[PDB]
């Protein structure tokens, strides 16, 4: 079975995937984030952060306030289910989390927390 997805965040402030449906049989799910292009993390950093649909705005806003040195995320934010590092061009990072953290009927959102990125960067996630 497929329990992984490869996602790219580029210099155009776009994710190449904006919808992920996780199979219920998967024990763990993996997101492999990469950054093709030429721009560094201080100006075009991208992360893949997962929260419930209701918690998205709060994670993004409190993330902007945390700054670059904290990867634009409130440290150990309880609303964050899974997160990758903030990556620049030529860098990559993967995050694997337990599918038991996802509930039937609940809606999740994945997004980048770099200031302003979430306007285009993102997508929906839920159990298949
Ligand atoms: Cu970004």
Contact between residue 114 and residue 47 where contact means Cβ atoms under 8 Å apart: yes
The answer to whether the annotation marks 121 as part of a ligand binding site is yes
* Alpha carbon of residue 98 to chain centroid: 15
CA 12 to CA 14: how far, in whole Å?
6
CA 73 to CA 88: how far, in whole Å?
16
Measured in Å, residue 118 CA sits from the centre of ligand 1 at: 7
Solved by what technique? X-ray
Instruction: Give the closest residue to 73 by CA, choosing from 45, 95, 43, 94.
Output: 45
Measured in Å, residue 114 CA sits from the centre of ligand 1 at: 5
Measured in Å, residue 28 CA sits from the centre of ligand 1 at: 25
Measured in Å, residue 107 CA sits from the centre of ligand 1 at: 22
Contact between residue 101 and residue 81 where contact means Cβ atoms under 8 Å apart: yes
CA 23 to CA 8: how far, in whole Å?
21
State whether residue 69 is helix, strand or coil. helix
Q: E-strand spans in 24-114?
A: 28-34, 49-52, 82-83, 92-98, 108-111
Half-sphere exposure of 89 (CA within 13 A, CB side): 11
Give the environment of ion ligand 1: residues with CB less than 5 A: 46, 112, 114, 117
Resolution of the experimental model, in Å, one decimal: 1.5
**Count of other CB atoms within 10 angstroms of residue 97:** 16
**Count of other CB atoms within 10 angstroms of residue 2:** 8
**Dihedral, 59, 62, 67, 72 alpha carbons, nearest 10:** 0
Say which CATH number the domain at 62 has: 2.60.40.420
Measured in Å, residue 25 CA sits from the centre of ligand 1 at: 30
Contact between residue 117 and residue 72 where contact means Cβ atoms under 8 Å apart: no
Domain count across the chain: 1
Instruction: Give the closest residue to 39 by CA, choosing from 83, 84, 91, 85.
Output: 91
CA 4-11-111 angle, 5° bins: 45
CA 47 to CA 95: how far, in whole Å?
10
The answer to whether the annotation marks 112 as part of a ligand binding site is yes
Instruction: Give the closest residue to 29 by CA, choosing from 73, 84, 78.
Output: 84
Range of the domain at 23: 1-128
């Amino acid at each position: 079975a497929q329990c992984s997805v490869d996602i790219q965040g580029n210099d155009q402030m776009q994710f190449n995937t904006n919808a992920i449906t996780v199979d219920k049989s998967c024990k763990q799910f993996t997101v492999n984030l990469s950054h093709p292009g030429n721009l560094p993390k201080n100006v075009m950093g991208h992360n893949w952060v997962l929260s419930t649909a209701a918690d998205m705005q709060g994670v993004v806003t409190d993330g902007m306030a945390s700054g670059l040195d904290k990867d634009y995320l409130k440290p150990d934010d309880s609303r964050v289910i899974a997160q990758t590092k903030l990556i620049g061009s030529g860098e990559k990072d993967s995050v694997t989390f337990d599918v038991s953290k996802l509930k039937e009927g609940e809606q999740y959102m994945f997004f980048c927390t770099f200031p302003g990125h979430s306007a285009l960067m993102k997508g929906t996630l839920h159990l298949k």
